[PDB]
Write a protein that binds this ligand. Structure first.
Ligand SMILES: [Mg+2]
Ligand SMILES: [Mg+2]
Ligand SMILES: [Mg+2]
Ligand SMILES: [Mg+2]
Ligand SMILES: [Mg+2]
Ligand SMILES: [Mg+2]
Ligand SMILES: [Mg+2]
Ligand SMILES: [Mg+2]
Ligand SMILES: [Mg+2]
Ligand SMILES: [Mg+2]
Ligand SMILES: [Mg+2]
Ligand SMILES: [Mg+2]
Ligand SMILES: [Mg+2]
Ligand SMILES: [Mg+2]
Ligand SMILES: [Mg+2]
Ligand SMILES: [Mg+2]
Ligand SMILES: [Mg+2]
Ligand SMILES: [Mg+2]
Ligand SMILES: [Mg+2]
Ligand SMILES: [Mg+2]
Ligand SMILES: [Mg+2]
Ligand SMILES: [Mg+2]
Ligand SMILES: [Mg+2]
Ligand SMILES: [Mg+2]
Lengths: 203, 102, 148
RNA sequence: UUGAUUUUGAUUUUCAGUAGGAAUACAAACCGCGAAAGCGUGGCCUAUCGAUCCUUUAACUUUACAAGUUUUAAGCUAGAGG
RNA sequence: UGAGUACAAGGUGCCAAGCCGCAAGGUAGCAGCAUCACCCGACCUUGAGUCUCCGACGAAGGGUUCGAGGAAGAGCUUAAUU
RNA sequence: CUACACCUGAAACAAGCAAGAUUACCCGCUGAACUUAAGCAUAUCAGUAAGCGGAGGAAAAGAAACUAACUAGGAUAGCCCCAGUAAUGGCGAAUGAACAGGCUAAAGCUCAAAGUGAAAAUCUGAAGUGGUCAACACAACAGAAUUGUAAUCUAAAGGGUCAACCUGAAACUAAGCUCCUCUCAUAAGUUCCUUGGAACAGGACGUCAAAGAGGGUGACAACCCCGUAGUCGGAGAGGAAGGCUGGUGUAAGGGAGAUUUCAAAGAGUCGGGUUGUUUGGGAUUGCAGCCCUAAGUGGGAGAUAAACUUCUUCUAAAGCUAAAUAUA
């Protein structure tokens, strides 16, 4: 232990010889995954690769501003779509029963998604018989033979261009932002003692 | 301030949801007493009798003074842990005492 | 690598530049292994190059969650640099309506004033503002808008 | 009569020009003695002394991380227990 | 809490180019060093007035102090040596 | 008292099951010192070696008594990050996870518990009959079982009342594909000189090439022989602990939505105390003994102990489950 350099942080203190991980399989592994995926396509041929995924906001204050692919559709949403979980599943839709909708907009996105899905759908019944729910589409669709990816057919755009208005500037200029944030933080701070005062002056 | 972060009111503005639209739950129905339950429990109660500590608490309740109430609580708290479960047991015992009067 | 290393040029010099008196030995010479005796014979080291190493500071956080503490900062100077040139010029000439810059979409939350602003007017949508940020924004012919 | 006091920081001695011990010169105070200038940050000067963790104390719109009120528990600055 | 008069991004001593001049020297002042000033925050100190008035806001005015900081960004990735 | 029934235990016999082996990876236990702290007890090495008990092709884990408090997310497992961070530690040496976010992979299901009571609707064996005869379908007779088998049900519900709209064991009957194993076959110089024991060398003339990877032939040979390439090609044989897809289609079986005096869920377990042990988990990280020992809007959880008011989230104390993962 000699010079000005930063205090070391021990690494190999235990017996690591038993505990090392090697990455050469990676090479072949990637490849394997490829073929797997491909062999899925072939065995699934008429149907799409990835099953239908709703969308939500991310779980953290910092992530809220972004968009994320959900695991499943909210029963509430399937209702507004008019699909039973079971059916949606026979369709290739992904359902999640513990998720709940606390916003109108979160219903909207997924409705739009579901509908979009259905509209673009082709359904093969036992040969030459037709059916009703989510319905069933004409025998000629058998010839249509669509191999498609879900991002192409059922996507989600957003562009950041924020529209400008002057009248509002005239408006917004009359308040004071700092003062605001301050008095607010303040209110949250002293709320408890204040309510307690109300209760105490009331009794 | 609802539209703002940091107000006593949570920042963001969301379109609220209807009573009809809200999450259907079951698991939230937990502490229900089905009459079947209730009856069965009463049956077995009579079939059973009280437990010795339950008896102690009972005497204390029948008396009714401040000291007696305290002791009822203390015992419930002490045998069961959880001041709360104590409160609950006091409730149950009182119910049986009161219903026994009639 | 190997042919660059000292060893090659040390071959046959017998001490390998570790000295004839003090040669290259085990932990005893290191002064004990690792951070050993920092507080004792290594006092001078610790004190001198890592002063304040031994001791305690103020307040334990049992579980610290960083996500909610997350607050990227922006400075006034980079504002116009966020939105394109098209915008600030086109509303330098056009006074009919004024530009709205959302710091949010850029991944920032609080706006601090650092430099100074063009005399051309703006609206800035941000989570928080510093006394001076608002000062300079307003004085420029601009407006502060609170987001969530 | 209590200047054996309130704030900080600096300087000199030993010196890795680290710490610690001493002492000095300032700037802000609040005082005591004297008519007053003045002199008082302890003993005429050169010795008389002690870190991390822990505890205890003084003073403070520091925290307990869904929200509160308590009780309790953590802190920041500084003494004492070595 | 946040690099506080929107039109700022300084002063001084050393000092390089370019331009003058045969020369003596003159002009200019990049980088660095030293120093003084301003700034954000810690710790102190001060405050008209304002409002969602009991807690926040702020015109004016400061520090013997503290900081791995501002003041026209210097980084990030790769290889090698010690 | 006898016959007889039932509960309990016993012997012989019939048909089946376990006993050891395996070591890399996996599971449940048990468990140290050398070493590092320049000494040394806490600590570290480290839940590490050795020891014991269990498996499998993987094991384990898994459908929340999870996170998070946001415009929320949502089984398990691996990768990347978060991170060397929060925390733990003679706060010394040194220990040290996870949420959010980017990916790989994707999958969800079975019980207990009011409801056959218009009737045990159930399970096992079976002389036997058909069969692809070890594997399938029926089956006279026998046992199991109301101290309860099967249908509904599993909280995402559900019962009851409507109901658009759906399904198909039986039998009959056509055509096919997948995967595995063992075999059989395929270009073009052995022309000429020189040196050699040998030409596969150096020269001269030639050829094939979706074949000039590599071998063997007396020497550094595309062309002499095996091969290589066309070949996820062609031909023959046998396979599936007895692979996979049709068409009619019976008794029978579902159910979006709608409404409704309905709506029931695991106990010496959860929780507490104490003592050990373990984790970063620090006055409630996990676990184990002993002592207490529940509840029923109850019960868990919301990274500081205890009340009290309000909000949030999940349903423990029964089970199954492919994939991505690990393999000295
Ligand atoms: Mg593998
Ligand atoms: Mg060199
Ligand atoms: Mg030499
Ligand atoms: Mg000395
Ligand atoms: Mg004086
Ligand atoms: Mg001391
Ligand atoms: Mg300057
Ligand atoms: Mg018997
Ligand atoms: Mg065995
Ligand atoms: Mg060793
Ligand atoms: Mg040693
Ligand atoms: Mg450990
Ligand atoms: Mg085996
Ligand atoms: Mg790392
Ligand atoms: Mg993720
Ligand atoms: Mg037979
Ligand atoms: Mg019978
Ligand atoms: Mg010859
Ligand atoms: Mg030849
Ligand atoms: Mg060859
Ligand atoms: Mg071939
Ligand atoms: Mg143990
Ligand atoms: Mg506890
Ligand atoms: Mg379970």
């Amino acid at each position: 232990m000699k010079h000005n350099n930063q205090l070391p942080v021990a690494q190999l203190r235990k017996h690591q010889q038993f505990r090392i991980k090697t990455f050469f399989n990676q090479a072949a592994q990637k490849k394997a995954r490829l073929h797997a995926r491909r062999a899925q396509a072939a065995a699934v041929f008429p149907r799409p690769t990835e099953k239908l995924q709703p969308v939500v906001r991310k779980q953290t204050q910092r992530y809220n501003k972004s968009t994320k692919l959900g695991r499943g559709f909210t029963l509430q949403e399937l209702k507004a779509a008019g699909i039973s979980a079971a059916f949606a599943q026979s369709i290739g839709i992904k359902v999640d029963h513990r998720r709940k909708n606390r916003c109108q907009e979160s219903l909207e996105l997924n409705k739009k998604r579901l509908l979009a899905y259905v509209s673009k759908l082709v359904l093969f019944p036992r040969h030459q018989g037709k059916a009703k729910k989510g319905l069933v589409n004409d025998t000629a669709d058998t010839s249509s033979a669509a191999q498609n990816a879900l991002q192409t057919s059922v996507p989600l755009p957003s562009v950041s261009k924020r529209e400008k208005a002057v009248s509002n500037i005239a408006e917004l200029r009359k308040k004071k932002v700092y003062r605001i944030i301050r008095q607010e933080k303040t209110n949250q701070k002293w709320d408890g003692k204040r309510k307690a005062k109300a209760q105490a002056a009331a009794e | 301030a609802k539209g703002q972060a940091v107000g006593i009111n949570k920042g963001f503005i969301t379109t609220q949801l209807e009573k009809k639209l809200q999450k259907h739950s079951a698991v939230q129905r937990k502490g229900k007493l089905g009459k079947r339950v209730a009856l069965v429990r009463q049956v077995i109660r009579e079939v059973t009798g009280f437990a010795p500590y339950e008896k102690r608490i009972i005497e204390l309740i029948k008396a009714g003074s401040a000291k007696d109430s305290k002791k009822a609580t203390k015992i419930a708290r002490k045998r069961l842990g959880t001041h709360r479960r104590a409160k609950v047991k006091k409730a149950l015992l009182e119910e049986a005492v009161r219903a026994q009067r009639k | 690598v190997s042919h660059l290393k000292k060893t090659r040029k040390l071959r046959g010099h017998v001490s390998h530049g570790h000295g004839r008196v003090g040669k290259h030995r085990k932990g005893g010479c290191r002064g004990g292994r690792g951070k050993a005796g920092g507080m004792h014979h290594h006092r001078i080291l610790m004190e001198k190059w890592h002063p304040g190493y031994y001791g305690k500071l103020g307040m334990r956080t049992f579980h610290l969650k960083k996500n909610p503490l997350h607050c990227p900062v922006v400075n006034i100077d980079k504002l116009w640099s966020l939105v394109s040139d098209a915008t600030r010029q086109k509303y330098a000439e056009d006074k009919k309506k004024v530009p709205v810059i959302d710091v949010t979409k850029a991944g920032f939350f609080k706006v601090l004033g650092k430099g100074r602003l063009p005399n051309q007017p703006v609206v800035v949508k941000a989570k928080y503002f510093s006394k001076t940020a608002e000062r300079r924004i307003v004085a420029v012919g601009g407006a502060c808008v609170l987001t969530a």
